């Protein structure tokens, strides 16, 4: 617990713009490539490495984690209310120290 250190008010903790959008933007971006390649499936070879089925699943699985990687830093967004004890989601659930 480190709240009596130097955290008077929620200055940095919390939100400050639209970061959630920047990340989600990647997901929608990849969807375009996934649907595009789907139209040229017949052109796909498959004897070079990745297949049409593998690429589809792999891609989605990639973009998914690729986006979260950006939200990771913004994870502190909810950390704001965390200061409250009434809720207690990551605190009561935590087990470190």
């Amino acid at each position: 617990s480190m709240s009596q250190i130097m955290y008077n008010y929620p200055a940095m903790l919390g939100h400050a713009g639209d970061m959630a959008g920047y990340a989600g933007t990647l997901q929608s971006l990849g969807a375009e490539i996934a649907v595009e390649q789907a139209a040229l499936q017949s052109a796909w070879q498959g004897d070079t490495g990745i297949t049409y089925q593998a690429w589809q699943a792999q891609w989605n699985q990639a973009m998914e984690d690729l986006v979260r990687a950006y939200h990771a830093m913004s994870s502190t967004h909810e950390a704001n209310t965390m200061a409250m004890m009434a809720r207690d989601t990551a605190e009561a659930a935590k087990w470190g120290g």
Binding site: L26, I33, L40, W44, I50, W55, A62, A69
Partner: protein
Amino acid sequence: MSLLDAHIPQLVASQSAFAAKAGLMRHTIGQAEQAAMSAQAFHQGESSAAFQAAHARFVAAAAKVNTLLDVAQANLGEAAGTYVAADAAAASTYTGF
């Protein structure tokens, strides 16, 4: 009763939209990463572990999107004709229990 140029496309395939899309992806990340910088102006120093992990997580996933963008064009052919003989450790990956 021959219909010459009525409801047919033009420069829709020869131009290769796939390629234009692949490059549009990196654009989202390149520009997005810049945003995180402007906000990092908080104090402007060097120390940043919490942010490091998040920063490394993104680049770690990018390898999946980039590698998939090459195989897609290489397998589709018409999509694009390029390669990246750089190799990496992320290309191997690993899974436990």
